[PDB]
Design a binder for these strands. Structure first.
Lengths: 192, 177
DNA sequence: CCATCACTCACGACCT
DNA sequence: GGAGGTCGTGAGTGAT
């Protein structure tokens, strides 16, 4: 006189492969504590899209490791801002862990509100980001604009204005990358 | 009748909670090559294909050293160069110098950093170049523009040995706003 | 202090 | 009947 016992297993299997996703994420052991399921899904959608992008693309030019990993991290920290690269649709691709000090919330805690750039920015400014992102890089490059990211208090909505500065680049071929070039950006705050 | 009105908001919340993970699993199928396709697979299979496909030397840094390098250059609008600690000659310069300083790689390669900076800094330049894995950082002027496609270029980097096979100064140089 | 939210996680019936 | 997926509630912790 029921249908349970099977749904209870489908959920425990889906929500255990999700914990597999979580354990495989290349984040610090201490950061994998709270990690709501829809937050693990977001971190996974970022990582497994910050590879393919590099996997199907041309092997990155230049020599093999002129600078150490810790050296590149120290340069990333020395930067007056934080790196943030996201696709033309809005989906994120790489958020710099240097944002821990320029925004208050760290990288992990920030990708919890969503996955698109349109999930971290205050909705009022969303319109702006759309007009500077619709036109691809035919020849229009080195775009610059401003938005109100989302400094907060641990749940949702002071909001620090940031000056986004960057230019679109090349996307690898395929289905998903259909007119979706990636857009690097040197994000810097407007109230140091 | 307020309790049902609160459970309605809870209903919409728990429905959004599921229609958001439906998007995260669809965008986990619409991007992976293994499940890029024909028959649309079930959710559990998409999650398993994600667990597996993720597994390529993932255990921290979130980014391959060279991927981080390429994204630093493509994001901070800078370039990478290796210079000599005695002769000052550049032994390697990135493809980024034509985008940033409007000069082709040839007009740098083979030349020295001394022929490329403002002389009233070049002496202090030697201070940064003279060794005596240490940190080096300095603001410096640089000749910007030879053809189509002076500025301040904050340079940051480290001094390492020179194993061409595999002392020199490896530095990233970005223009200050 | 208290109630009231926002979020999370599971668990069943139910559709198609 | 079975494999799969959608929908509302009941109950927890905590922000405010």
């Amino acid at each position: 006189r029921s249908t349970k016992g099977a749904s209870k297993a489908r959920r425990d299997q889906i929500n255990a492969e999700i914990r597999n996703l979580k354990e495989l994420l290349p984040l610090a052991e201490a950061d994998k504590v709270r990690l709501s399921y829809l937050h693990i899904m977001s971190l996974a959608c970022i990582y497994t899209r910050k590879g393919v992008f590099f996997a199907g693309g041309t092997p990155l030019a230049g020599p093999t490791g002129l600078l150490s990993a810790q050296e590149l991290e120290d340069i990333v920290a020395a930067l007056p801002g934080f790196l943030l690269v996201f696709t033309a649709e809005g989906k994120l691709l790489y958020l710099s862990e240097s944002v821990s000090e320029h925004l208050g919330h760290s990288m992990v805690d920030l990708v919890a509100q969503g996955d698109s750039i349109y999930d971290i920015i205050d909705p009022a400014d969303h319109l702006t980001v759309r007009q500077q992102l619709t036109m691809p890089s035919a020849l229009d490059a080195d775009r610059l604009f401003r938005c109100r990211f989302n400094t907060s208090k641990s749940l949702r909505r002071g909001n620090k204005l940031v000056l986004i500065r960057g230019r679109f680049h090349a996307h690898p071929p395929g289905a998903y990358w259909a007119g979706n070039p990636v857009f690097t950006a040197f994000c810097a705050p407007l109230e140091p | 009748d307020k309790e049902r009105l609160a459970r309605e908001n809870h209903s919409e919340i728990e429905r959004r909670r599921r229609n958001k993970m439906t998007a995260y699993i669809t965008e986990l199928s619409d991007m992976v090559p293994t499940c890029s396709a024909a028959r649309k697979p079930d959710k559990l299979t998409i999650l398993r294909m994600a667990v597996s496909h993720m597994k390529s030397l993932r255990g921290p840094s979130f980014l391959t050293d060279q991927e981080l390098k390429h994204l630093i250059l493509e994001a901070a609008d800078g370039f990478l160069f290796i210079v000599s600690c005695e002769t000052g000659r550049v032994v390697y310069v990135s493809d980024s110098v034509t985008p940033v300083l409007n000069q082709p790689q040839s007009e740098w390669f083979g030349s020295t950093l001394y022929d490329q900076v403002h002389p009233d800094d070049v002496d202090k330049l030697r201070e940064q170049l003279s060794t005596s894995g240490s940190r080096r950082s300095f603001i410096c002027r640089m000749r910007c523009g030879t053809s189509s496609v002076f500025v301040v270029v904050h340079c940051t980097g480290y001094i390492k040995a020179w194993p061409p096979a595999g002392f020199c100064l490896v530095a990233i140089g970005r223009l200050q706003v």
